[PDB]
Every structure is written in structure tokens, then in C-alpha cells.
Design a protein around this ligand. Sequence first.
Ligand SMILES: N=C(N)NCCCCN
Ligand SMILES: N=C(N)NCCCCN
Ligand SMILES: N=C(N)NCCCCN
Lengths: 113, 113, 113, 50, 46, 47
Amino acid sequence: XIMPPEAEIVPLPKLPMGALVPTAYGYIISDVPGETISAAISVAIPKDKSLCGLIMQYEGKCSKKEAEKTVREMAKIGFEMRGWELDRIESIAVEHTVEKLGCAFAAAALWYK
Amino acid sequence: XIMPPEAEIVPLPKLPMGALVPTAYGYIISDVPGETISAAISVAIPKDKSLCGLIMQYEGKCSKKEAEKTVREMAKIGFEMRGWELDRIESIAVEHTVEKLGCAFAAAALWYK
Amino acid sequence: XIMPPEAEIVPLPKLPMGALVPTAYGYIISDVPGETISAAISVAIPKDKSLCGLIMQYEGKCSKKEAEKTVREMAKIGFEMRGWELDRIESIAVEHTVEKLGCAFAAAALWYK
Amino acid sequence: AEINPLHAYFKLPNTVSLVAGSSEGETPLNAFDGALLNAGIGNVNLIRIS
Amino acid sequence: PLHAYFKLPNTVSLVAGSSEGETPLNAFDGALLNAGIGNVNLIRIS
Amino acid sequence: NPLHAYFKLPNTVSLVAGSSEGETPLNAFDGALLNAGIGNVNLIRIS
Ligand SMILES: N=C(N)NCCCCN
Ligand SMILES: N=C(N)NCCCCN
Ligand SMILES: N=C(N)NCCCCN
């Protein structure tokens, strides 16, 4: 996940080493050579600025494009379930083709301005 | 889980959205139509108020009744393992009959008065 | 995991009951009679004190010595990946031979002086 | 009136509330989210304690 | 201090333990008790 | 100028992502975090 009301989405700041960072994340690990794994994260922002944003995570054996589409849909469903008006959805995803043993990771890290 | 000493069991208060809530929970998700799933939480309260309470969680493919009976037993066992005198055990459980994909969730949310 | 820079490895302090303690841990549970299970934790300490330490965790169906060897190696690898000079690695391990159902647990609890 | 329990380690929670809920969902995570909402704790960040 | 200052954890303690249990959770609980951290709330770090 | 800001609720969110190979699952995970730019902090998973 939940983005606090009035919180701003910003590029990752210079975090002090060892910080206890509240993080919503999705990840997947695979040891299957040639296998393509992906992870995605989405943040649904409400029109009503008094409300919170919803953070959804996804991971699976699919393409980057498929992962982001899925996680974005998940965020939308979250707002539909609450019945809140959506402003927009922000997201990113990553895919990895396993060589020997690989990991795909996506997250929303909460911190302080 | 652990209920801090002297903590009070109260109805869930209004929580600020996005709040970071320390929570002990049990949950189960099933995608088998017609299957019954449950989750339960118990809190064993000590007679010695300087001691802490023990929070147990349970989840499985059984009734709400069995789920609660089991989690209460787990709390009882926890106190026996510590050798502490039990005052009582507070618990709650929930059961869900899956239609297509469902989730049963039970929790003990720690907060501030 | 991550041991903050300037943090110090000390014996477990007297923690207030119910305290919310950030902890890196590994654990394994088994119901296979006679099976030996173990868990270990390692902390790679940097020579450059402005850097952080890396905490690794491991658990498996093996002896205590095997678990500790593995987790110490994981920490070494973690420093090689970062290209950091290694001062030393502190580690701990535990093993358990299952009677009916048992658990092996190893952790690095982070706290404050 | 806000508090980050992970930073204010010297301020322990002094209340406990038992909640439970269930829900269907189009994905496991959405079902989970629905269950939390049904439990009345769906708009907060749960820091799982073990 | 009259003014609380934010700080990162500055101590790390290694502990370990094992235990039998009637259920997985009770065994895990017994293991923490054996390790000396059975009565605090562990916030698992990733 | 707010004081004791770190004791209050986080007020920023940052999306990151990365991937990596590893000799073990945990090392691969670590490499992924490092690749995402968040490898030297303690992640407290929120759900
Ligand atoms: N003793 C603990 N902190 N944890 C194990 C028992 C509680 C499981 N909810
Ligand atoms: N409502 C919550 N706090 N959690 C469930 C939905 C968030 C999934 N990252
Ligand atoms: N870099 C991190 N924060 N985590 C990855 C490794 C975690 C080992 N317990």
C-alpha cells in the first residue's frame, strides 16, 4: 503493498547501507537453462488524493511484456474491488533467460524524502 | 507471534491508510472449486501479566471448527513449552468454500492505543 | 541480510518481550524420523568499515558442518560479487536429528545498543 | 500521529486485534487482497511477524 | 537524549537452536526458544 | 521543516527491478537486488 496517501513515486534515492526498507516485491528463481523468467511490480494511484495507492507484484515463467500487462491488470482489479476511481497505474518489469541459475526481481521500495 | 506484556486485546481500531502494521497471520489460497479452506489465529494470555502472550496461526483444508480447535491447541502447547500459567485463549477462525479461486485469512494485528 | 556499517557483532542483548526485531534467518522442519536437518548463518565483514557486512542464511537436510561450510561460502561469493575486500566471516550453525517432527533454526538478530 | 515500528524500536505495540476474512479473486494476490479487505485490514501494509 | 535520533541497527547477534514439536509451528517456536529469541517478534529481513 | 520524519510513515515509493545469475538461489537473489540497485539494504517485505 500500500502506497501511503500523498506519497510520491520517485526514482530510487541513495539509501543508507543497512536500512530497513519496507518493500513490496515479486521474484522468481530458476535453474532451468534457457528458461525465461520475469517479475513485475505495479502501483495504482487514486484520483482521490486522500486515498492510498495499491501495489501489486507478479512473477512467473513468461515474457517481460506479459508480466507487466498481468501486474497492471491486477492493480486495476484491486481498485475495482475497492470501488475507487483510478488516476493511473505506474509499472515496470524485467525478464531473465537462465544460463545456469537465475533470478528476476521487481519491487516497490518505500522510503523517505 | 508475540503479544507484548500488558498489551490489550481490542477491536481493530481505525488504521491510517498505508500504515505499517506488525501482523501475525495465517492464510491459504485454493483454486479447487467446492473445496473448503480455513484460517485461524489464537492468542494465549498469561496469568502473570509481566509475561507476553503467544500468537499462533493455522491454515488448511478443513472446517472453521477444526481450524479454531487446532490453533487453540497450538497456543496451549506453546505455553506448556514455556512452562507459563495460561489465563485463557482468545481466537477467531474463518472458512471459505472456493468457487474458482479463494483465500481464507486470519490475523492478529498489533497496534497502539 | 545486511549488517549496517559500524554495526558490531555482540552476544544477544536482553530484548524486551514482544519487541519487533529485524532478523535474518534460515530454518527447516522435517517429519522424517532419524533425518538430520540443519541451519546456518554467516556474516561477511568488510575490511573497509564504511561498507556493510553481508548476512547469508542456509538450511538443508545435512550435517551442521556441511551447513556452516555452505553458508560461509555463500557470504564469500557475495563479497566477490560486490568486489569487496573480506576481513572475516562470522558464522553459526545448528543440526537436529528428527524424532517425530523437528526444526533447525539459525538467525542474525539486528538490534540497538 | 504516525509511527514506523521498524524505526521506533523503543515503542512497542500495546494492543492486539483479531481479524479474519475470505474472498474470491481473479488471481491469488487479488484473492488475498480481497480477504484482507473483508477482514478490515486491506488498506494497510502488513509487516509479517514470525 | 531529550530528542530521539533515528538510527540504523548497530548490533548483530548470531543465535541458533532446534526443537521437536507437535506441529511445524510449535517446533519452530521451540527452536526459537532454544535459540534464545522465542519471546520477541521476528521481522524477517530479505 | 519536519523533525523525526524517519519515525513517521514512509512518504516515497520507488519502483526497481533487476535480474542476475548466481551460484545458489540466495546468491542469485542477491545479485538481482544488486542489479536493481537495492542490494545493500535490508528489505522488510510488506504484504
Ligand atoms: N516465538 C516466536 N516469535 N514465533 C514462533 C511462534 C509464533 C507463530 N505465530
Ligand atoms: N491489501 C494489502 N495490504 N495487501 C494485498 C495486496 C497487495 C499485494 N502487493
Ligand atoms: N541483499 C539483500 N538485502 N538480500 C539478499 C541476500 C539475503 C541473505 N539473507
